[PDB]
Symmetry: D2
Subunit: 198 residues, 4 copies
């Protein structure tokens, strides 16, 4: 059984960068929808699985990738932002970003171009490639999860579905991305990094 995680800050804690109204609808409407449908779908699936019914298992796959992915991605998302975040990573995480993108700024330009560039709904991700020992940016469509579709471990992700910025920045998806770099909980992406290194 899956549950909606509690938000770790209040809904208006990230104003002026992302405001309360967006935070509230994102969490308790959208994310709530995903874990409920995830729970329904996993249940239908199990029953299909027991009957040995392969047509049903395959029929169910799009709902399980959409709702399972939504739940995963929004859950990493909420911990990736903090009332008290922004600035630059430190330690090993920042030297991996220098090692792989040249510098933090060339890292920002590249994750801003990938997120801005998604055609339709999607997410931009900073991920860890454990097969190669290095950081990598990937973009994903719809709610498709970074690890399950790609194999990379998600460290920082940015929602660019229009429900994530539209009441506030309207169509200006670059203004949302300039705003977002101000609330990034670098302390959490460092920890995400650190568990791969384990």
């Amino acid at each position: 059984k899956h549950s909606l995680p509690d938000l770790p800050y209040d809904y208006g804690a990230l104003e002026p960068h992302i405001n309360a109204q967006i935070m509230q609808l994102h969490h308790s409407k959208h994310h709530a929808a995903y874990v409920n449908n995830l729970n329904v779908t996993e249940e239908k699936y199990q029953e299909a699985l027991a009957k040995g019914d392969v047509t049903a298992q395959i029929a169910l796959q799009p709902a399980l990738k959409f709702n399972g992915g939504g739940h995963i991605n929004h859950s990493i998302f909420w911990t990736n932002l903090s009332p008290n975040g922004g600035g630059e990573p430190k330690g090993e995480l920042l030297e991996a970003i220098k090692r792989d993108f040249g510098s933090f700024d060339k890292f920002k330009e590249k994750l801003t171009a990938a997120s801005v560039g998604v055609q339709g709904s999607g997410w931009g991700w900073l991920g860890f490639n454990k097969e190669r020992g290095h950081l990598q940016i990937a973009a994903c469509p719809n709610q498709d999860p970074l690890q399950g579709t790609t194999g990379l471990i998600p460290l920082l992700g940015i929602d660019v579905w229009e429900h994530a910025y539209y009441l506030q920045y309207k169509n200006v998806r670059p203004d949302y991305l300039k705003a977002i770099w101000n609330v990034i909980n670098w302390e959490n992406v460092t920890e995400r990094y650190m568990a791969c290194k384990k």
Copy 2:
């Protein structure tokens, strides 16, 4: 070479159903963007094609499908709404629908479910299957147009991208749907029906 069509009604005209601020953004910002990037892609494709560069041509296909399909689809969408819209179609279109669906209500139910059901960004479409001579409800992702990708002739489309409803309906995509029926310009839909029995 491609021009943003003029909306055939003032922005404020489909109130209270679709509000004036969505109509201005959707037309002047969302559709205007598609036309302009389509123009730039067609031109680059022309050069790529001139030179026999198959890599460049393959690399420009997403851009050309996204923006060209975006321009097709919003232009049909604007002719599908009217201040004088709503109600029911009469004559040969209503007969067509009744054979194919049973009742306008079943039709309406089947296309609302096809619209509300899209995952991520996309469109639901009432189309005509020329080979079979029959009406068909398709759904397309992102901006992929009906004819170019399915071969169905576009009769009626309803955009369900979040930018089409969010400022007014927020996440309640069914409330948007129920309201859009009130401005559907059945005159234009039947012209299109008339034209592929042409």
Copy 3:
């Protein structure tokens, strides 16, 4: 637990149209691979499901659609051909084909164009659309099943992966399709039809 079905005729029973060597490799090498990997994958999945692990369930989806689909499709395939088949359907099935494609011959041209037309590996299908009460041809990529991806009930399908004709017809995929119409067990596609009508 899934098992390789027994072939209902000997491996050379369909010469000269499809020969023994192809039949043997298709059944006991290729189809055998699919049900074994289906059995491994369903098992991994169940265990992922129990742990509530969504990333693993999604990771497993391509192997479950590929191997589950392979098993389904090849299993319908073997019953679709007979040493003693060919000719034309009778009864209701033939009047549905007249009703939907105009005639049996216009039915053959259309399922031959769809199978010939698949780009890469795939299958052409004659299917039943239970939502609309009519027959429909669909083409599918790789081993994606007709009912699980599309919702149509499979009645007659044609494998056009190259392992299905290459040792015999080489690249001339039209020669394989002319040959195949001679071994089609129409008595079985009638029965498949009849269970939808139930």
Copy 4:
């Protein structure tokens, strides 16, 4: 406008590794087909483009990606084999591979697994990531070319479509793979390495 390149060796030359009958079919029938349908599509696209017909352009994209990518990919493939092939690369390419993979053996293992692992028709590719300056193993489906779809520069490709091995290896795609190492023309691969550090 596009021409089938002449094979740089006689058909019989990669015996016993790849036999003479596969080399004749693959070149004169499989690749010759791609070139010719590419020519016909480029021309129709030209007309579609001349007229500002975005539907026609979108409808011709599969054909143009299938056939153009098919022509790209087989042409690089023929320069990748040699009668005088096999063994190991030496010099700067072998250094590159060793940094990126560890040993030629790990490289060979990782690309064989990426090749044997494709589902359906496709290709495995050793590529260069220009932005990162590093070697990458990609796999592509059907005929989608590396650069046009991933941006990686194509260094070494191995076709794993069934027509590339079936007449000689039947379903044992690993035996094909193990043998193809014996004709890889590492001279041509390194020219390509040399050229995007150009």
